[PDB]
Structure 1
Amino acid sequence: SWQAYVDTSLLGTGKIDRAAIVSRAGDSVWAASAGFNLSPQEIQGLAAGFQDPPSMFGTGIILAGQKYITIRAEGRSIYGKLQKEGIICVATKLCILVSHYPETTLPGEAAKITEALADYLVGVGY
């Protein structure tokens, strides 16, 4: 199930404290952790971001009512920071993985985990 990807594969690592999985088309949310509510408008915004990554630097990344400062934006990867926490968004063929990390995990760690899960899902065909 998609929820198992959130709970077991991302939260279960101890490095990512909130997560969601959403449609690449920005039409729906397939799975999400407790409290981490992404609105239709937010997922539509994030989905549009992957289609024009440089634009994300001007807008920032708005998810769960929070605006993060964009530090990376390319066709597959949109990363942000807010103080010592941050957010890693990675697009697959059919979805976008969204991972939040706390101050205690290296940004490289959350990125590596989330990018790897994305690569897995691409290899599987998603």
Structure 2
Amino acid sequence: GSGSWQSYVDNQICQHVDCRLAVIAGLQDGAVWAKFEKDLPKQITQQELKTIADAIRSNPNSFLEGGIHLGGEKYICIQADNSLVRGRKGSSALCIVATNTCLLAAATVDGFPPGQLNNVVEKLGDYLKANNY
């Protein structure tokens, strides 16, 4: 009851994987509910999040044209559908999920197992969807 989104992101995502970034944002407007970052070239922006939210909801295939832009970095898409987008930049992995109302995204540090990242993000997405979030 009444816990902060920042605590939730830090706990549910960032304590479970070695992240370069982690963000929970609103699916309508790309408004950041909470985010954590390590040393990104640029801060994650509302614009970046709105573009992702709009794309995953309207045309996930669109990520094949130009990639996935977050934190001033470009990830090349490896999977795209309405609920799940995955990409890679070098040995860093990105996983993005859409629930009813939010977008969840996290990218790992170079070399961290992508499968762990994906499982954590996707499990948390599922939990949230089951609670109507």
Q: Under a length normalisation based on structure 1, what TM-score does the superposition of the two structures give? A: 0.92
Cα-to-partner distance string for 1:39-78 (whole Å, 9 max, x where unaligned): 1221111012112011111120000111111111101011
Task: Select 1:22's aligned residue among 22, 25, 49.
Answer: 25
Q: Is the 8 A contact 2:17 2:116 kept in 1?
A: no
Cα-to-partner distance string for 1:4-46 (whole Å, 9 max, x where unaligned): 2211111111443420101111341100014563212211110
Change (3 A) 1:123 1:108: same
1:57 paired with 2:60, answer no
Q: Which moved more, 1:50-59 or 1:102-111?
A: 102-111
Shift of 1:120: 0.5
Match of residue 99 from structure 2 = 92
Q: Is the 8 A contact 1:2 1:30 kept in 2?
A: yes
Change (3 A) 1:60 1:125: same
Residues 3-42 of structure 1 aligned to structure 2 (within 5 Å):
3-34=6-37, 37-42=43-48
Q: Under a length normalisation based on structure 2, what TM-score does the superposition of the two structures give? A: 0.87
Residues 68-87 of structure 1 aligned to structure 2 (within 5 Å):
68-87=75-94
Aligned-partner Cα distance in 2 for 1:75–1:110:
19
Q: Give 5+ residue unaligned stretches, structure 1.
A: none
Q: Which runs of 4+ in 1 moved over 3 A?
A: 14-17
